[PDB]
């Protein structure tokens, strides 16, 4: 008759044990009679034994900077075996928390990237990417691209198909993200792609045309950026919307008392770039809308058309600007992701 055998998922005396996974113990030639795991202060860790008695596993989050002692006994027809193991878990120098957009359960437009923003600079971008699990249904190829040292984006080659489910699991707890920085916790969000809404602003006509699943539903006269402060061409992702907002140029790097500075209260404002471009109500320029460009870059429309835009456009819908005297919106603006060529985006920038 054989003596039972105990096998744990950790080794006695180990250090740097990662807490991204549970601790387990298994028995062979016998069953587990008792397993306890305690903190250095003596507090027991929650765990559960399988019904057949062969496997025990922790069932609660294990802590950073802990010394745990595991005690296990197995019993079989051939006798008994007992082991005691002590190990230390990872000791981070820093913790970073991820924040994910869009919100859980949200319905968003066909331009919405997955966005994961860490509250600290990430030294090992590849480790962060490998810790993020994206599920799509219907499945579609996509790729990660970093906008700065803290925020990574994931998107497909082309705009999302309406009706797609997107699941984002940021599994960074216990993961070394470089230079001793570990994830503060896990985060999990899910969103769904709604109707295709693409609004095109053509400087040749000074009309902003809104198309919903390919059909024109609204044609709004607009006044875009004057020649000295023009609106950049390119693809813009719709962000936040405001019934009213004080637009402060200092938010976008321009002092208010400077030649192109401003501080202006506007109604019905939909943000389309981090650089400060909005679609918004402009009662002062209704005469120029559809005729001449007068703004600092914003898409001026009538009060009723700005309210319509606020009511009918959602986060992740698309505004495309064409034929202006500006350049192209930067790919790393924050809402300019689609201006990066797919070959470049797909290659990534983790290194
Ligand atoms: C994931 C992408 C697609 O969008 C979002 O994270 C939404 S956060 C929000 C927007 C916005 O209109 O989207 N921002 C600004 O302007 C702020 C910039 C200047 O820091 C941020 C903040 C107020
Ligand atoms: N708004 C600018 C300065 C504007 C001003 O000239 O008063 C800033 O504080 O960055």
Numbering used by the authors: 57 to 407
Describing publication, verbatim:
To further understand the high-resolution details of structural changes may that occur in LdtMt2 upon covalent binding with β-lactam, the crystal structure of LdtMt2 was solved in complex with the experimental carbapenem drug T203 at a 1.7 Å resolution. Electron densities were observed in both the S-pocket and the outer cavity of catalytic pocket in the LdtMt2. Consistent with our docking results of T203 drug with LdtMt2, the 2-oxoethyl side-chain of R3 group from T203 could be modelled into the electron density of the S-pocket. A second T203 drug was also modelled into the electron density map of the catalytic pocket. In the S-pocket of LdtMt2, the 2-oxoethyl sidechain of T203 drug is stabilized through hydrophobic interactions with the A171, M157, P169, and L390 residues. No electron density was observed for the pyrrolidine ring of T203, while its carboxylic group fitted into an electron density making electrostatic interactions with backbone nitrogen of S296 and the guanidium side chain of R371. In the catalytic site, the T203 carbapenem interacts with the outer cavity at a covalent distance from the SΥ atom of C354. The amino N4 of the pyrrolidine ring makes electrostatic interactions with NE2 of H336 and the backbone amide nitrogen of H352. We observed that binding of the T203 drug introduces unique allosteric alterations in the salt bridge and hydrogen bond interactions spanning the entire distance from the S-pocket to the YkuD flap of the catalytic site. The T203 drug binding induces an additional alteration in the YkuD flap by breaking the hydrogen bond interactions of H300 with D323 as well as D321 and also the interactions between D304 and S306.
Among the five L,D-transpeptidase paralogs of M.tb, LdtMt2 plays an important role since an M.tb strain lacking the gene encoding this enzyme exhibits attenuation in virulence and exhibits enhanced susceptibility to β-lactam antibiotics. The L,D-transpeptidase class in M.tb is comprised of at least four substructural domains including two immunoglobulin-like domains (IgD1 and IgD2), a YkuD domain, and a C-terminal subdomain (CTSD). The YkuD domain has a highly conserved motif HXX14-17[S/T]HGChN containing three residues analogous to the catalytic triad of cysteine proteases: a cysteine, a histidine and a third residue (Cysteine 354, Histidine 336, and Serine 337 in LdtMt2) to catalyse the transpeptidation reaction. Based on our structural, biophysical, and biochemical data, we identify a new PG disaccharide moiety-binding pocket (named as S-pocket) at a distance of 21 Å from the catalytic site in LdtMt2.
